[PDB]
Paper text:
Class IA PI3Ks signal downstream of tyrosine kinases, G protein-coupled receptors and small GTPases to regulate cell metabolism, growth, proliferation and migration. They consist of a p110α, β or δ catalytic subunit and a p85 regulatory subunit (further referred to as PI3Kα, PI3Kβ and PI3Kδ), with a broad tissue distribution (p110α, p110β) or enriched in leukocytes (p110δ). PI3Kα phosphorylates PIP2 in the plasma membrane to PtdIns(3,4,5)P3 (or PIP3), which can be converted by 5-phosphatases to PtdIns(3,4)P2. Here we report on the discovery of UCL-TRO-1938 (further referred to as 1938), a small molecule activator of the PI3Kα isoform, a critical effector of growth factor signalling.
We next attempted to crystallize full-length p110α/niSH2-p85α in the presence of 1938. Class IA PI3K activation upon binding to phosphorylated tyrosine motifs in proteins occurs through the release of inhibitory interactions between p85 and p110, by: (1) release of p85α-nSH2 and p85α-iSH2 from the p110α-helical and p110α-C2 domains, respectively; (2) movement of the N-terminal p85-binding domain in p110α relative to the rest of the catalytic subunit and (3) interaction of the p110α kinase domain with the lipid membrane.
Author numbering:
A (entry chain A): 3 to 313, 322 to 501, 523 to 864, 871 to 1065
B (entry chain B): 326 to 591
Amino acid sequence: PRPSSGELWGIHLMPPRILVECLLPNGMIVTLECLREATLITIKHELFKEARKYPLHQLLQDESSYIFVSVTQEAEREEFFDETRRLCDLRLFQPFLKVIEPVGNREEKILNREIGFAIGMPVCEFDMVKDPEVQDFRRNILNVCKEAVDLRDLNSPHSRAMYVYPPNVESSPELPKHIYNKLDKGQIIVVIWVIVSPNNDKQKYTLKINHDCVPEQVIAEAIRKKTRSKKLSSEQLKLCVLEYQGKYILKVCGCDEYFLEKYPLSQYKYIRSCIMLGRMPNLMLMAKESLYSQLPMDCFTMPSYSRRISTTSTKSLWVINSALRIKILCATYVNVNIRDIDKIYVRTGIYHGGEPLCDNVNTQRVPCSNPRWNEWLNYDIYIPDLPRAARLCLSICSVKGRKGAKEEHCPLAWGNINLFDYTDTLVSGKMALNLWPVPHGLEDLLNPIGVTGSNPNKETPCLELEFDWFSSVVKFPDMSVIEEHANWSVSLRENDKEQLKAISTRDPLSEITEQEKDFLWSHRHYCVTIPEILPKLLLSVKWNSRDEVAQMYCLVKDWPPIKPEQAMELLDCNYPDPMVRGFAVRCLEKYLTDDKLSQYLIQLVQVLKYEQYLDNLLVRFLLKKALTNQRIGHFFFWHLKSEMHNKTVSQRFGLLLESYCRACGMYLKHLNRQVEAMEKLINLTDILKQEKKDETQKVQMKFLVEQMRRPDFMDALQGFLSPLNPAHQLGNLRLEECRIMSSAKRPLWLNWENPDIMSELLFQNNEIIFKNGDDLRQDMLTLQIIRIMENIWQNQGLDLRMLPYGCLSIGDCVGLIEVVRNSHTIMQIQCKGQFNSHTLHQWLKDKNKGEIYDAAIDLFTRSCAGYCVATFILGIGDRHNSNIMVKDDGQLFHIDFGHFLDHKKKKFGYKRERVPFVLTQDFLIVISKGAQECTKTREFERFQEMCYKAYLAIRQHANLFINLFSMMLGSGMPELQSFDDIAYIRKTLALDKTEQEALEYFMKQMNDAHHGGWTTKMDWIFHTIKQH
Amino acid sequence: MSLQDAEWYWGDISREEVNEKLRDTADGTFLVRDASTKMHGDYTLTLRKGGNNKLIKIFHRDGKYGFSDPLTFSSVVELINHYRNESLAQYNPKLDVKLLYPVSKYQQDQVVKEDNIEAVGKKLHEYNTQFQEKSREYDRLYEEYTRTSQEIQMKRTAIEAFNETIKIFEEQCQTQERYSKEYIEKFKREGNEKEIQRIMHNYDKLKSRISEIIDSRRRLEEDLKKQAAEYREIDKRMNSIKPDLIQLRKTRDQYLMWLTQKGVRQ
């Protein structure tokens, strides 16, 4: 288990000096001893000096006439045009260099190498792909690239600044009451800083303005205060302000977050946070010009592959008068133990999303050692009834029948195929399909949620199929044809209206009866009056009848758009129809704010895996957004890149990343600095986890220290943007604060200076944990959900302070984690109290003496309520004093989630909804400020109502969370695999109960788990206030 | 004749529990359970049709019961049998299938034949123990499978890199041969012998270099072969224990349910 992807194949680090084989153009070979960090400029020069001592030396030209080519660890022939790169940074397969005269389109070659580096794969690999769908994607997606780059450079330089520095804003300007009341009669105090020439002194202005004010008005007020002493005519003043108002721009002190857009100030997230937290907003004023000057010109260039030439009886599907027939021929091999298995067979099914369009069909059973069927399988479906998104889902299965009449079936390998290709052609003739390994945890014989297409790895079980032929190319019919047919397919009410409404208010995974379906379908024209019933109407549709589908098409054509929160459902694995999904994208296009798109990016990227084809409306929409807003583009890039190792999506994500990198402008050089930083950190931790694993910590710190001081390491790990938040610039490393953490995977705790000139006001330290070895996708998802919960609560005037710290997966079990400062585990706290129940409260007291004591209690209480409710709903793996933390100012939060939903049911069998975060007496004592009888205090009653409100607020937004989890089923998370996995949150949110029953259920859970203490200020009959 | 003693009436089991039971079964398979609302009167019939589980609400008003609006029954048992013999076109005239295979409580509980709560408890302990053990093994195997898969990919990519490398060194040889021949003819014709051997010496060096690189690739091909064999054996062993591990889990879940049932309830 020791192969390495370091500086050479098989070697993590080059020795300080190394022999490099140099292949001269005259056929000679010169062995040169090189410093591992020497540049190619040095090496080339040293080589051509030495080459004089070798034969046929006169045939060599000026060294300036040549560059180096070699083989990289990706087995590409790479030409080294940038001779300032270091030998150790080249990613050589083996230490040799070949001398050639540079040919060809240099600028394209250089840009393709930069793209290749960014995405983790040489773009030349794309040119080899025979699949017409792939080459068509590459060419056709370029339109979206051009449309974005044009739209970016249109209103220059302002439209460019907006692309690079988009406004970080909330989704509405509307202030919740708990926020507004913290203002001073609707006004905020802000501090505006200016760097004055010539000594770059810092001057401070404290302003008091309406929260409403646009940045330009903030600047206006600043001009007023500045010219206070130099008194003038009010008209010249009002006109002075008017003339120079748009001469400056505002910036958050400490990070690269600008206010370039006329949103009200309080709608900016930084400012909104400052109000909520009672923190002084510190902004920096600068001339518009000193920003617009920085902004790189982004030029987009049409690639070569857009400049190449690529080389009658077309029957409507609907006039093919036959049943569906598919032939299973043979499979090359299975890996089974012949002694443990009786027979193998191929299982098949025709699907629309997760629903079978007819019954599944097995081949006959045959011996393990001879996988041959030659069988036409007959499906109970008429070829013209095949919906556009129909798929063949299959598996090779083993069967063992050794106990009674009982047998055990196991899928060995699976594969899905679109019945129509991306041009609406019904597949025909022979096909060979390389199958995929069955996902860990999956027990079903088919895997219909899985991606379609052949396993690119051709050293895998290969199934030969054959589809029917109709002596002609067969195509899905035109929209004109379908629309016409619907017309000719179509040739108490107060109770009905109120029942439809009731059906529409239920959650996406709510049971719908056959009665309700026939009811929905029969009132389909009336359903437009309640447009958000669309998902349920769609699932009432019989997708195996062209008659019904044609009619359903005519409805979604004119369907009124519905909110993003609901349209996203139509992009999960249950709604595969290209019209249905088009409608969904149109809703996103019109109503999804950039803020919400960023908020839900993780899910929107994941549902790309569900798309039948490379080219679709969703991917064009996402790429467009990624290319018109760089904060979206950054995370777009990193979410795609982090999965490039997963062969089920690396083609699709690779092609998508290529087109993004080609058009993203200068930000590609910033991303390349991030990727090389991450690559160095992977290599450094690989060494610690492999070579040096049986060494002590002290020795490991010695090695770490000497490595980080090397020029090639310093160069790469200083002066780049944080991938967690690229508004944070990572400057010089503070080596004395960097360290390897104690845990097993060997995380690195890294610390950078912030080169922002006003870093003392905010983020003096940028600290990150880099972790190589743990799968971080579940933490990232859980932290995301917490963030969304917190945002829901805030919007309802519910101030429950959560701490959804940054966690970013950046590749296969590798990621970054934000460091939360001044925070300690409960265990650590009890260990510095010997400790009773009161140690925690006492700890908190000492850290918040005097007037600030109550603030800490309050903050502890609110954060406690938020995590109590969030963990209950999500079923986070049980809490203990090591995965629960508290800050010095009393903010409580949780870490290390790594387990959720009904994972425990599947392991132990016990059918129960746990209460993961049980508030022990330690916590109760804090909330009650030390009272003897904690549950009977007003503070505990206040804490309770917080929990009740928080709970109902998430329940009221149940659609959003069910849809967000549903979009993850195809993700590769063992814990999040079927809709049955999402059933757990339907339980905790008590979605099949009334709201009042739901709150009753929540109180009953808390009581059972805390053994009493949770009381109602309602009467049990009407839930009306009975006290105070 | 009573709802409770009916073999297909399963009480308060979930949708999901029914999905598991009706999974991959034949058309006509059915069962009845409490509604997911738990409104104390409403029950749900679940029927297998065309590879799909159908939920049919059982409407309970006055003293009657009905699929459709005309409430024309008196017990749930009545209704199920009335459709169990005749066709289901009476419900809705489209694609009648009636009700032909019932998922029975009774064949399930024969799996657990221990008399006392202590006999059951003890066998639950054994099965649970075996299950957590055999889970652990299978998890361990999957990690090895995953590590082995990755390494094989690295090695495939490394073999391609050797192939490209070897090609380039072979090109150098051809380059050296294109050139040197017109010089050996001249260094002989002009007396120099040491310069000739410096050419030959560089050619020998290149030749031996190519031969070491070719052997290195040969050795990697051999390792790839061995590891490809380990990989398929790891796959065999996972294929062997998967179905046994599934069965065992259902047995554990069954005893646990059985224990629950013969324990105090509230």
